[PDB]
Design a binder for this molecule. Structure first.
Ligand SMILES: [Cl-]
Lengths: 513, 512
């Protein structure tokens, strides 16, 4: 909890190695939700833990959160500690005897990190308490929340300072640090979240000049390779973290891995994310044609996986993201590829089996990894910022600006890279939905859907009755209801924890809580 | 959260400075509850936040905790992280190129710390998951809880190793670190909790030889001086932490400071601990005579602070622990001493005002400190004091049948506050006298909760608690301050629900 300098002697900020270790500690404060609870609080997923952790984790889905049970994932509590560690750096770096150029670059990294930490809070609660110094007894602690606009201004001023102080690239040893590109890329998302469209376009223009390149995704394997640990050096990654959780209970891969693969491997997995029939329906055919829609099918209707072509002829991102009945995974594991069976094996009736009939692929390296048996690190390459987002943030801001042709050109870059034909749509209202739909498919299971629904204000449309599939034979299935969700507009903001509000007279709760 | 070595280069454990920093990080993992929630969950205090944080902090007081709302103070979650950091030290210290003697002492400090971290868990949940290595993907994580006996064995084996490897004393620079005495002192406490009485006596005998000495407490000022920052070098301290919380909302002093002292100073305090009438009633007269008892007084009855002598003629520990109506505090602050007023100023009707008519003194340095103005405040938390050796010894000696020995030991604690010696020869009666002495001596030192739990006296203590309300500058009435209840399941803290559902082999405590 305490900043790193509290462990050392009254000569820490002079030592370049200790100051470099302090910044490493700040990077170590980047948190990854292995359980992807926000995604499971969106129309993209129904958790395999829907029933097991209903009251603990998914009260949002039924508008049952309150200030007393906020289910904020302790972001308010945790992220102010992270911010405190940044503010300390900023307080003590001035007196540092380190070289001006190195001191400047490190300060830039802390600006990027502080911006990133505040953005995690702002995207949830809206306006927060803005702190640029480490509070002491000398300070007044009854500090009100600033406006959301002020908070977005604070984040963006930190990212402006970051773009001015960070390098575009690093040497072999320092690869993984924040770049000029990472700062501009985060800036464009923060600006898009606050509807600063003229600014988004400018930020995107900067990233286009920094030599990033979209990985070829004309095959499912090719697209999935963005997330491969053996491809961690590709030109699409702008900012990432190799997340290797200590415990099996919080390990991002094991938590979202198919459970009943125990005919060849084991039941070490927890199922985790359960892609919905609504998301499956949104994946287009390889030629840019819509697929058959199954979500609104009557429950007594039986389909044959081979007569209907439910999992046949889809665009590469479908096979890249979705583990479905008959999917082959773990090709380069001992014993080779295992075929996923929703009829006999991974069933909703079994504990931690998929309730939707689907599991996530994407950042799970089923292509290269071996099965995580107990005996004899299963990290995830969590890509916080990808080059694909620059195009989609640009497409979104360009449309809202009136540049329909620029928007079309930008979103068609994302479609071109998966062999999808170009969008032709000239109507702004129709083109907006097409961009939004592309964003959903592009960034599925990348912790964005929940904030896209929130910022686009499409909660009533998405938090409804969600569906999945259930197999009645090795070849046949029925469409099922997987979650009966509801909505209230207060859910456009996360409640501030009750104990925090009662602590301060000036601290005000979000509307509806 | 991650061990310190994860931030540095693959040459960390060779560097003596980095290894020394790792152990500093392990010491930094020692947590102090500035709000003293366990004490506020005992018959010694009714928090000024009784109503404000009823459902978040004090569900224990009304048997309303559950596996889903355990109110365990996140000890299970947090302490396994602390233990993980210890186990990594033990895994990687072998490869260290540091001097054998320094390496041995440091390893001893980590044994003491790991024992201390597991004891915080065991004293709450009972049996826990015993881990001596850092779990990896290679390991099976479905590990059941060990028995409470096994857990006490683990803690005590760590403390045995600590006594063998730690020095009795340090130089000026290394003062504050775990000593041989601290390890023996913690051992005696852990042994007493697990009713290993023959062992307690042996552990206490060792501390008596290590040159500790009880501070003279024949005056309230003298007794209070144990917790003075200007007396941090006294011979009574066995193990302590100078706790200086970052925020005003978690600062041990501000949280438990009299709120309405704003006639001379301010309203920066939050009241916090509210000594009960029940505890006030337990403080004897200076001559070892019982005081008048007021807790069961009728509510319509009015008393005069001067005709009755409620706060007059008490033994030094009374004035050393309790801030009551008419108490003078902040003598050596600018503007000088302020007099506490329960009639006009610090009233239960005011927010964060004392609901009992009392506030804690003890470790709040109202003698020396200046008022914490928000212009331009650490507590010396003494985890282990020499006074405990005598009382742990007295306890174990009585249960062993050494009534003469038990009397001798408890009379050491009474002698230092000018109280006459106990004469009681009956073991059953002497038991209660020792338990009574323990309550007064260690009031507001996070022990009462665990004393009630281990002695199994929950029904007797978690009832209707009382306090006072002033109706004039001189007159007061006795009030109900908390209507508590009890259930025997409260003799153990529930294991958090999400932890239980995670594992087939992980079993919940009885009643939850
Ligand atoms: Cl304040």
């Amino acid at each position: 909890k305490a900043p790193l300098d509290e462990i050392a002697d009254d000569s820490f900020w002079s030592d370049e190695t200790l100051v470099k270790y302090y910044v490493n500690d700040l990077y170590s404060e980047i948190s990854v939700d292995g359980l992807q609870l926000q995604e499971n609080r969106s129309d993209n997923s129904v958790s395999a833990q829907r029933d097991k952790y209903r009251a603990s984790w998914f009260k949002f889905n039924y508008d049952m959160v309150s200030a007393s049970d906020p289910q904020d994932d302790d972001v308010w509590e945790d992220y102010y500690v992270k911010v405190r560690k940044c503010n300390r750096f900023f307080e003590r770096i001035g007196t540092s005897t380190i070289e001006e150029s190195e001191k400047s670059r490190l300060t830039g990294e802390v600006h990027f990190l502080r911006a990133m930490f505040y953005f995690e809070m702002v995207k949830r609660y809206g306006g927060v308490i803005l702190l640029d110094k480490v509070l002491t007894m000398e300070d007044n602690w009854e500090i009100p929340r600033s406006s959301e606009k002020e908070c977005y201004d604070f984040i963006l001023e930190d990212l402006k300072k970051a773009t001015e102080m960070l390098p575009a690239s690093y040497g072999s040893r320092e690869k993984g640090r924040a770049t000029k590109g990472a700062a501009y890329a985060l800036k464009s998302r923060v600006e898009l979240y606050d509807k600063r469209y003229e600014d988004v376009i400018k930020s995107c223009a900067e990233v286009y000049k920094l030599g990033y390149e979209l990985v070829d995704g004309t095959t499912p394997e090719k697209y999935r390779s963005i997330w491969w640990t053996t491809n961690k050096d590709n030109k699409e990654i702008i900012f990432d973290v190799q997340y290797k959780s200590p415990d099996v209970y919080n390990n991002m891969m094991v938590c979202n891995m198919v459970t009943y693969i125990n005919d060849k491997y084991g039941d070490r997995g927890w199922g985790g994310l359960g892609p919905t029939q609504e998301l499956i329906d949104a994946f287009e055919m390889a030629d840019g044609t819509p697929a058959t829609q199954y979500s609104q099918a009557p429950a007594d209707q039986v389909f044959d996986i081979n007569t209907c072509g439910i999992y046949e002829g889809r665009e590469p991102r479908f096979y890249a993201n979705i583990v479905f009945h008959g999917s082959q995974i773990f090709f380069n594991a001992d014993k080779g590829a295992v075929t996923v069976d929703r009829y006999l094996m991974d069933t909703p009736d079994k504990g931690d089996g998929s309730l939707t009939g689907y599991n996530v692929w994407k950042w799970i390296d089923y292509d290269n990894y071996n099965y995580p048996y107990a005996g004899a690190d299963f990290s995830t390459n969590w890509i916080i910022l990808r080059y694909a987002e620059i195009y989609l943030n640009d497409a979104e801001a360009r449309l809202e600006t009136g540049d329909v042709e620029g928007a079309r050109k930008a979103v068609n870059m994302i479609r071109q890279r998966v062999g999808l034909p170009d969008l032709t749509e000239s109507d702004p209202e129709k083109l907006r939905e097409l961009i939004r739909k592309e964003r959903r498919i592009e960034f599925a299971f990348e912790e964005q859907r929940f904030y896209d629904v929130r910022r686009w204000k499409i909660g009533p449309e998405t938090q409804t009755t969600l569906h999945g599939v259930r197999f009645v034979s090795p070849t046949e299935f029925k469409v099922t209801k997987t979650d009966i969700r509801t909505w209230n507009d207060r859910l456009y903001l996360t409640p501030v924890p009750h104990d925090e509000i009662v602590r301060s007279s000036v601290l005000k709760q979000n509307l509806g809580y």
